[PDB]
Amino acid sequence: ELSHALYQHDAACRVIARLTKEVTAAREALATL
């Protein structure tokens, strides 16, 4: 369980890592318009 949990933790960490830059691009998109 420790191994599976650490794995899924870093995996879902990448989810926020991508989503944050997605929101970040969308913010400048809407801001420039």
Partner: protein, 48 residues
């Protein structure tokens, strides 16, 4: 083994998310050109 079961469960879910985001914009394209069709039709009416 649990990593694949958690991956394959949500692999369609990561696909199912952008499916609508395309189709929500895809329907917006139809209404876009629908008004764009109305936008050209009256320009000739005012040109006339």
């Amino acid at each position: 083994e649990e990593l694949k079961k958690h991956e394959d469960s949500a692999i369609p879910r990561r696909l199912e998310c952008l499916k609508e985001d395309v189709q929500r914009q895809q329907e917006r394209e139809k209404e876009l050109q629908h008004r764009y069709a109305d936008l050209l039709l009256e320009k000739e009416t005012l040109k006339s």
